[PDB]
Amino acid sequence: GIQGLLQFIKEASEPIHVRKYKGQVVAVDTYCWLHKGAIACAEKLAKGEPTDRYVGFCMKFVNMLLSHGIKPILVFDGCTLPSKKEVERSRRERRQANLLKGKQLLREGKVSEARECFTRSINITHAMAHKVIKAARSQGVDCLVAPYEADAQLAYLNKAGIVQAIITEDSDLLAFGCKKVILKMDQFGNGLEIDQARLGMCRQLGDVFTEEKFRYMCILSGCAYLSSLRGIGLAKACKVLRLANNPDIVKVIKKIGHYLKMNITVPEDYINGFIRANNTFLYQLVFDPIKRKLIPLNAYEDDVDPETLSYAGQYVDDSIALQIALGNKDINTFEQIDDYNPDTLY
DNA sequence: CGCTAGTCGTCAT
DNA sequence: CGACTAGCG
Ligand SMILES: Nc1ncnc2c1ncn2[C@H]1C[C@H](O)[C@@H](COP(=O)(O)O)O1
């Protein structure tokens, strides 16, 4: 997620109701609902007791969408992306702590604080996701497990014209080049929409409303794939790309201190990591549900060698990718946990 | 002052 | 995933 991006481009946002997309197709970033839903039953999840409350939670949203003639496609995160591994480890660490300190507090009588710890330690498993998937399919709703981050899969579905809008809490989706994004959507259908075309409604951006420069700015502010330089956020990054008159981004980043009148030490690795992050936003693997095969989010340019792009996701055989996308294949064990055949979105 | 970095909350009785 | 804020320059 781009820290503070939603406030930074807030003038491009427009309150809406989802009936706006009646009779159209909308893809969902389902881990947002999953997380919110799992919080409601955190005690039982932390204690290992059985629960399916989070299923009902997600399902009231899905049913709400259906009541307004919306075709939802639930998308799920798949295998872990190397580019993101660090950030993920950090989350795990925090969760681990909040589990121990939680249990600790249960052995000190204090349950009020223990629950506040349990709510911050929930880990969303693939089994839980799959429960949501079965529940959804029982209502005729398509589900799709992304090969890697759902962000990219969603962006792809949007850019391909497969869906008209993405529902998510996550600002990243704009850096991936989503067309339309629906944030803050509640159980009634009220949300905030940001169109890519309307980023020019943000005077604060200047000419940084093109897809490329916007992406550069997001990376420079600090993202999941690369931490910012010391003291650089959206404002500074944006400013740098505004004053930037050179087309080559590397030389810009080498003169970033000059553009901001600061003494910024830029490590040589920061460049390669920037290239890495850029390439990850551009080329992260996704699954074409129509051709049923793995593809990068955008076609490889002449300036990128795909062999160097392992951090953006490893290729696997299309048949495996398909079984993962169907939610048939367990991400961890790669064993078959279900037998859904749609032949008897795809 | 604007801005970044780090801490706290998402559920729901 | 984000919102909020104390404190940084
Ligand atoms: N605490 C919390 N609240 C809301 N959304 C969250 C949270 N942690 C992660 N996420 C989002 C980030 C990803 O888009 C997705 C999977 O993250 P993963 O870490 O694999 O579960 O869920």
Ligand SMILES: [Mn+2]
């Ligand atoms: Mn609760």
Ligand SMILES: [Mn+2]
């Ligand atoms: Mn895989």
Ligand SMILES: [Mn+2]
């Ligand atoms: Mn995500």
Ligand SMILES: [Mn+2]
């Ligand atoms: Mn993201």
Ligand SMILES: [Mn+2]
């Ligand atoms: Mn070219």
Ligand SMILES: [Mn+2]
């Ligand atoms: Mn202040």
Ligand code: NA
């Ligand atoms: Na930053």
